Design a protein around this ligand. Structure first.
Ligand SMILES: [Mn+2]
Length: 610
């Protein structure tokens, strides 16, 4: 009642170099599914803001597939669990959870009747299991391959069959129900990463590390041919092929390869039809792909989602973002753009009204970014664990990471504050307070270890939170600071912020407390109420433009909105704001709109009325 999520700029799928990514989809093909963290993302092809998230696995999610009926989703994790849950309601009630084997689930396949599920992976006692979705009842045995089963698929037509690809280089076929081994095929010479039946079940194809794509008769697995690219010698791709998928009408196959291309094939002629290069960088390798009734999507090693135009043979849309923990957020002065940074140094720009993303490239840092701030002139200041404070300019395309000023710091930067106009920047470091005013990086040693910093709107005060449980407030004269007040907290300071009108300074700490101070009154307590509603370390704080409300994000997964005009009132608690994830950054876009970002790679927008 007190708030509502109005938009989500979702996490990209989890990816690992040279590792296949498996996608799922809704019956109509209007949404794709992928995993990151302990979550399952159902991402719409026609919306950049309405992705749905299911977060109930306790272990890292691997693959998720929605049944042909569209009513259930079966998702696996690295532990070997396959949870089958309702997709129709936000409560997502669990139907069944089955421990298929001890180890990671790599692929899942629903039969055409939405009655059976075959799950495969790396398991101690077996590599695959087939069973009933609703009861967990075994519906056969998938014994037959000697190493991890990487891909599995049901024949959608009768007689029923199940095919699988394995690290033992073979493709196996099972007949049923009940299902049992029928044959093995050794056309491949390296790991088989993907096996898929066409829509009518008359044929299936396989591919993998040896770069070839084989076509087979759907009922008995007899090879009918191999795909040819006349520019290559006896291979479909010049590198590993991580996945293939069939067009809805079965006349074409699309493949994703380490060779950095997506290729579309003509099934009838067995010849390549379009070759679509994604890029020339190592991150442009394609690790997964799926063709739905509404879109053909391929995934880059960097997690980017590429929407392919099969007619033109090109890439239509690329959705960027993060798959690593987001650590900082900063919006542009005009409120049209949002910048987000992560734990691996990546930064993305987002158009706030549409959700359209852009990955900053080149990369400003190669490691953790502990802060980023925009200036009324379009620059973006940043600090990272590589002990550098960099200033990215505007020239190349929006923010020119093309090339700009890097300054070594004497100690690691933990926090960053910058004046609106960019005239002054202060970085709170492990052993120093670094001040940046037009070229001169002036460093002031401190006796304690800092943890965060805030600069008053009028540039007169610099508040430095410390690991000594004190907020050190300094008056800033040029490139020098003089401590005018030392505020004591019960535990280490975690974040600080000044209201835009300079009326208040707020500090949060590891004891889960949020404490505001009256600036005009020598930083005395602004009120005496106990703002201890978070149940875990508070990670961030930010003031509303109205200088009265503020918000905090915590490791307890929540965002809490506080009201300075009613300190005894219960605050607004957005519980589970980021499910099973710390909320690392929160900022206000206006007096009733908050944006939060989490360890989960998600960026959420919240409408919070008065
Ligand atoms: Mn299938």
């Amino acid at each position: 009642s007190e708030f509502s999520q109005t938009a989500l700029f979702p996490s990209l799928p989890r990816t690992a170099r040279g590792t296949a990514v498996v996608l799922g989809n809704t019956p109509a093909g209007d949404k794709i599914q992928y995993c990151n963290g302990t979550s399952v993302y159902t991402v719409p092809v026609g919306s950049l803001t309405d992705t749905e998230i299911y977060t109930e696995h306790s272990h890292q999610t691997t693959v998720a597939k929605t049944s042909p009926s569209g009513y259930y989703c079966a998702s696996g994790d690295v532990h070997g669990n396959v949870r089958i849950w309702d997709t129709t309601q936000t409560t997502h009630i669990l139907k069944t959870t089955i421990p298929v084997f001890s180890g990671p689930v790599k692929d899942i396949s629903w039969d055409s009747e939405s009655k059976r599920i075959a799950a495969v992976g790396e398991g101690r006692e077996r590599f695959g299991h087939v069973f009933l979705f609703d009861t967990g009842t075994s519906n056969g045995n998938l014994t037959g391959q000697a190493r991890a089963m990487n891909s599995v698929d049901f024949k959608p037509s009768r007689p029923f069959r199940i095919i699988s690809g394995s690290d033992d280089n073979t493709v196996a076929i099972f007949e049923g129900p009940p299902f049992k081994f029928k044959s093995t095929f050794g056309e491949h010479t390296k790991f088989v990463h993907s096996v898929r039946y066409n829509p009518d079940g008359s044929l299936f194809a396989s591919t993998g590390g040896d770069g070839t794509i084989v076509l087979y008769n759907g009922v008995d697995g007899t090879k009918t041919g191999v795909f040819e690219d006349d520019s290559l010698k006896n291979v479909a791709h010049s590198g590993s092929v991580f996945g293939l998928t069939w067009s809805p009408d079965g006349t074409k196959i699309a493949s994703a390869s380490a060779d950095k291309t997506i290729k579309i094939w003509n099934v009838a002629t067995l010849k390549v039809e379009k070759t679509i290069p994604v890029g020339t960088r190592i991150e442009d390798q394609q690790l997964g792909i799926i063709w739905t009734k509404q879109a053909l999507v391929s995934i880059s090693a960097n997690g980017f989602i590429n929407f392919v135009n099969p007619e033109l043979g090109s890439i239509d849309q690329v959705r960027y973002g993060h798959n690593k923990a987001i650590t900082a957020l900063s919006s542009s002065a005009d409120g049209k753009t949002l910048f987000s940074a992560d734990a691996e140094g990546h930064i993305n720009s987002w158009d706030i009204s549409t959700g359209i993303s852009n990955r900053v490239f080149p990369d400003v840092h190669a490691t953790m970014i502990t802060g980023i701030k925009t200036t009324s002139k379009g620059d973006l200041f940043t600090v990272s664990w590589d002990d550098h404070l960099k200033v990215v300019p505007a020239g190349g395309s929006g923010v020119d990471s093309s090339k700009a000023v890097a300054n070594k710091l004497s100690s690691q930067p933990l926090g960053l504050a910058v004046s609106a106009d960019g005239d002054i920047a202060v970085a709170a470091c492990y052993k120093h307070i670094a001040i940046y005013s037009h070229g001169k990086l002036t460093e002031v040693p401190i006796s304690y270890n800092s943890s965060c910093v805030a600069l008053s709107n009028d540039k007169q005060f610099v508040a430095v939170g410390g690991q000594d449980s004190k907020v050190h407030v300094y008056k800033l004269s040029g490139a020098s600071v003089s401590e005018v007040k030392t505020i004591v907290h019960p535990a280490e300071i975690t974040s600080v912020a000044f209201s835009n009108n300079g009326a208040f300074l707020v500090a949060t700490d590891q004891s889960r407390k949020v404490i505001p101070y009256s600036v005009a009154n020598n930083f005395e307590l602004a009120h005496t109420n106990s703002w201890t509603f978070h149940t875990a370390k508070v990670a961030c704080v930010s003031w509303s433009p109205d200088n009265v409300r503020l918000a905090t994000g915590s490791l307890d997964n929540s965002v809490i909105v506080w009201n300075m005009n009613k300190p005894s009132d219960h605050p607004i608690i957005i519980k589970g704001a980021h499910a099973m994830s710390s909320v690392n950054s929160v900022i206000w876009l206006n007096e009733t709109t908050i944006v939060s970002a989490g360890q989960d790679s998600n960026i959420k927008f919240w409408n919070v009325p008065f």
